[PDB]
């Protein structure tokens, strides 16, 4: 497997809300990331997976934080299912995760 990561091109409203509701590990990871971010004085990123009505007025920093948190949580969720990455490639923001 090669895990390709995507930049900030296609971040739409209410993305990854199905996973945030039907998976407890995903929700725990998102809550952990939100607590850490609020520790770093960054804005909270919790509503981006609950409300879906704040995506319209999301600041660029909030959007990038949401993108990276989503990428990390999604990768961890897929790894827990038995995905053995052989190499990782990225993009503008896909390199970090």
């Amino acid at each position: 497997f090669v895990l390709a990561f995507t930049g900030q091109g296609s971040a739409f409203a209410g993305m990854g809300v199905d996973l945030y509701k039907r998976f407890a590990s995903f929700r725990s990871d998102i809550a952990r990331y939100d607590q850490i971010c609020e520790g770093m004085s960054l804005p909270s990123i919790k509503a981006m997976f609950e409300d879906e009505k704040v995506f319209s007025t999301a600041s660029p920093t909030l959007q990038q934080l949401t993108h990276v948190c989503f990428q990390m949580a999604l990768y961890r969720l897929w790894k827990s299912l038995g995905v053995q990455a052989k190499a990782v490639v990225g993009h503008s923001l896909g390199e970090y995760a």
Binding site: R32, G39, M40, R76, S80
Partner: protein, 914 residues
């Protein structure tokens, strides 16, 4: 006017020894129940962990598996916190239940803890008795597991396991001494402002341990980087804390509430009655809060508050000063630097510190019958053992063949099957064998039929295994001096009969040449123990066990389980192997199991299989208190036994050493014996190079560990031997034969020589000399240590992959009353079911008298007791009376002269006298 404090400690204290001590407790029902229920709750709470954390948790059947990992440092924070909590709670419960300690009360006691003992503090301040404490203790165990898991999750999110970990979990904190906390805080602030670290990865002051010492926590890499900045005369020490705690910048109330969400809500929760000292919090005294509320407070202190460990003493003293008391009697459990607690607390009080009284002896004796330990996991005493071995007819001849180092192997006698037609060096015909050697019993077909109510035509059709089992069982019962219905433990319905057999050659080749009425009952294997149950009128279980070359030991295990469960009070455990079917030998040879040259050359560099050896053995077993109350002759004790399978082998037949080492470690751990306690090891030793080398490696690794410096840990020598070089391989009685050798060795205090090594040692074995283990080539003294015991380890393996092993201990020190029988005249009685047997009994009795003429005065009273109160009196009878032993000899000699002259014996009339 002397307060007491129950102070619990954090993860700094090493609690592995306490865990082992609690696991070894036997004489406390409440402690055993708590130690049995804690692991189940712990496993249930572990199953509720995240995906990442469940791959870093080991599988354990019992808490005996977390001790080696706790010592090795390869235990994740959740399990370590739970084990610390379990150890503290178990120590408190054992102290206050078996130790007969008055439970703490809100007028003379207080509780205290640090970062893991604050949980047990509330758990103990909520209850009022041990029974009222166990469920709260289990709740606290679950809460501790959750707390550890949460801290571990945050830590693992904050940093990654460095590439140079390899199992161990790096420390997240270190003690720094030589600088006040208010200045180490400034050092941390300056280092943060300079290095420009993230607010979450910054080092923090996790504890204020004193006026010139503290504890600073951070991730391994950052912690090392910051510690490298600290210079003399400041001292740094590395604590074994594997996760971040006491971090207000890493935890919030959400984590605290998540931790305590395993406690269901209710209005029945107890409050806290014994005041708890909370020195870290703003208020020191905590009383009145419910159980879950105070539990959440404790979790909050352990996750969000810094340890104010420099104010504990001043707090405790203050509490004592509020009630008017004048002294403190510390009662720490698993606390570090506890020795200073008392002086530190009393330093602030006006004084009056005084010593403490004694334990008051055993504090009342136990009622007779209540002094024992429960039937569950009690020593299994051995009372007597009889057997027929090659070139032998007793255990004494067995010792004669052993101590003289004889090789009993020989070609197949013509009674079993021919050799000029059944054997060839290059087998070209069908069913022909490449080998023909074996260690046989030449008197297998020798039975006393009339004694056992058997017809002359019923006897030839009974498998010699059944006949020899009857003979040996009767002999062993006589030696043990047990009569049916004589006492509570020998009631006919409390006696089971387990056995081990693996063949029915008599049915297949001998009695199948003409099938008759006794074919099935004569040949079937269940009748082996069936006859023993029937003739002696024993109405208990009757089993036959077939685990190939471990049956006798496997069967033994079964019996012990019964003894441990209470199904029977006495067991008759046997093992038989009589070879009469040539095809069995031919198939063992075609499968490349039999040595084509001779006997079993155990440990020899030219070991090429084994040799088949016939043997029958029977042993009498009881629980130790049962044999002590009945005043029975105790030879040895069994402390433990276990079994598993060599499933990971590379084939069905060949063995596997990892499972064997696991089995040995399991039995050693359950018995509570270190490697030094064992002195001998009767190895399976079948005489195979691969098998011998693997078994030797496993045994030496278990019992002769090698130090990291390459030296030996054993302070005393260790010896290893194999019976199969002398008498051969039994394949169903090998375990009982080995046990018989061990019993004889314990009797004679000798280690026989080894005869398997013919040419040169095997080059595959470890360096035994470096490990302080020897293979005695000449007989060696094996004295019993004074005020001590000799302990042995016995193994038995099967070609089907089954491994059994047990631990043997010396019988207790016999303490006879040593009182003088005031009587003057004594009687000696002899009996038999035949006149010839009467003559034989008289002759053997006069011979025994000649051997024992000049022993002591108690010999005659004890002989009278043994002959009268510990025997079954048949029809034909004889008696003698005397004031000394010589009169008995003369009387019996005259009776024998009369019998031999022609005075035939007549059975006494069935009804008896009026």
């Amino acid at each position: 006017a002397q307060m007491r404090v129950v102070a619990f400690g954090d993860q700094t204290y090493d609690c592995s020894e306490a865990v082992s001590q609690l696991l070894r407790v036997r004489d406390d029902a409440i402690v055993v129940d708590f130690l049995e229920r804690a692991p189940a709750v712990l496993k249930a709470e572990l199953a509720r962990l995240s995906s990442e954390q469940q791959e870093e948790t080991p599988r354990f059947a019992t808490l005996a598996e977390l001790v080696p990992r706790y010592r090795a440092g390869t235990l994740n924070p959740a399990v370590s916190q739970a084990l610390t909590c379990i150890a503290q709670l178990g120590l408190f419960i054992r102290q206050h239940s078996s130790g007969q300690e008055a439970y703490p009360t809100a007028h003379d006691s207080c509780i205290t803890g640090v970062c893991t003992g604050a949980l047990t503090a509330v758990a103990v301040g909520s209850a009022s008795s041990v029974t009222a404490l166990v469920p709260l203790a289990l709740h606290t165990v679950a809460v501790a597991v959750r707390l550890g898991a949460r801290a571990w999750e945050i830590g693992s999110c904050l940093a990654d396991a460095r590439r140079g970990a390899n199992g161990r979990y790096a420390s997240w904190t270190s003690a720094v001494g030589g600088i006040s906390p208010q200045d180490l805080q400034d050092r941390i602030s300056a280092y943060t402002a300079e290095q420009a670290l993230a607010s979450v990865s910054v080092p923090y002051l996790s504890a204020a341990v004193g006026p010139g010492q503290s504890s600073v926590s951070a991730a391994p890499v950052i912690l090392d980087a910051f510690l490298s900045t600290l210079l003399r005369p400041l001292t740094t020490t590395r604590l074994p804390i594997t996760a971040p705690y006491h971090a207000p910048h890493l935890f919030t109330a959400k984590d605290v509430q998540h931790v305590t969400d395993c406690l269901p809500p209710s209005e029945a929760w107890p409050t806290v009655r014994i005041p708890i000292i909370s020195f870290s919090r703003d208020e020191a005294v905590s009383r009145g809060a419910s159980f879950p509320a105070a539990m959440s407070e404790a979790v909050r202190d352990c996750l969000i508050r810094p340890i104010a460990l420099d104010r504990m003493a001043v707090s405790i003293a203050n509490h004592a000063r509020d009630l008017g008391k004048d002294s403190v009697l510390p009662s720490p459990i698993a606390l570090s630097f506890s020795d200073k607690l008392g002086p530190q607390v009393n330093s602030h009080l006006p004084g009056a510190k005084a010593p403490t009284p004694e334990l008051t002896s055993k504090s009342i004796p136990s009622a007779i019958g209540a002094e024992q330990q429960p039937m569950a996991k009690s020593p299994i005493a051995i009372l007597a053992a009889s057997g027929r071995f090659p070139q032998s007819s007793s255990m004494d001849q067995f010792w004669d063949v052993l101590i003289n180092g004889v090789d009993t192997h020989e070609l197949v006698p013509p009674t079993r099957w021919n050799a000029a037609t059944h054997v060839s060096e290059d087998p070209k015909a069908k069913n022909v064998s490449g080998t023909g050697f074996g260690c046989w019993l030449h008197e297998a077909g020798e039975f006393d039929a009339a004694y056992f109510n058997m017809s002359p035509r019923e006897a030839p059709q009974v498998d010699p295994a059944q006949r020899l089992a009857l003979l040996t069982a009767t002999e062993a019962l006589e030696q043990a001096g047990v009569v049916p219905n004589r006492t509570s433990s020998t009631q006919k319905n409390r006696v089971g009969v387990w056995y081990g057999a693996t063949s029915n050659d008599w049915m297949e080749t001998n009695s199948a040449q003409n099938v008759d009425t006794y074919f099935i009952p004569g040949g079937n294997r269940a009748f082996i123990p069936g006859r023993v149950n029937y003739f002696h009128k024993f109405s208990g279980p009757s089993y036959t066990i077939d685990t190939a070359c471990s049956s006798s030991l496997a069967a033994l295990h079964m019996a012990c389980n019964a003894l441990w469960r209470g199904e029977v009070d006495t067991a008759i455990v046997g093992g038989t192997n009589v070879l009469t079917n040539p095809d069995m030998t031919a198939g063992l040879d075609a499968g490349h199991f039999l040595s084509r040259s001779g006997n079993c050359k155990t440990f020899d560099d030219e070991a090429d299989g084994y040799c088949r050896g016939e043997a029958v053995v029977t042993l009498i077993l009881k629980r130790l208190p049962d044999a002590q109350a009945d005043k029975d002759p105790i030879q040895a004790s069994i402390l433990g036994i276990a079994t598993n399978h060599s499933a990971e082998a590379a084939s069905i037949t060949r063995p596997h050493a990892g499972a064997q080492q696991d089995l040995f470690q399991q039995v050693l751990t359950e018995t509570g014996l270190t490697a030094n306690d064992i002195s001998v090891c009767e190895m399976h030793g079948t005489g195979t190079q691969a098998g011998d080398s693997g078994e030797t490696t496993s045994v030496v690794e278990t019992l002769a560990p090698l130090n990291r410096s390459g030296s030996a840990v054993r302070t005393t020598p260790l010896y290893i031997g194999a019976v199969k070089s002398n008498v051969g391989h039994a394949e169903s009685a090998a375990g009982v034969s080995s046990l018989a050798k061990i019993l004889l060795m314990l009797k004679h205090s000798k280690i026989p020589p080894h005869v398997g090594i013919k040419t040169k040692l095997n080059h595959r074995l470890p360096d035994l000399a470096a490990r302080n283990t020897h293979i005695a080539r000449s007989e060696v003294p094996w004295p019993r240590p004074k005020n001590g015991k000799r302990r042995v380890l016995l193994n038995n393996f099967s070609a089907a992959g089954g491994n059994t092993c047990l631990v043997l201990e010396d019988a207790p020190e016999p303490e006879d009353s040593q009182e003088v029988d005031p009587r003057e005249h004594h009687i000696v009685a002899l009996s038999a079911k035949t006149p010839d047997s009467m003559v034989n009994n008289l002759t053997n009795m006069i011979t025994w008298i000649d051997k024992h003429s000049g022993d002591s005065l108690a010999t005659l009273p004890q002989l009278s007791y043994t002959t009268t109160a510990r025997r079954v009196h048949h029809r034909h009878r004889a008696v003698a009376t005397g004031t000394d032993l010589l009169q008995i000899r003369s009387s019996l000699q005259e009776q024998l002269d009369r019998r031999v002259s022609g005075e035939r014996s007549i059975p006494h009339p069935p009804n008896g006298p009026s």
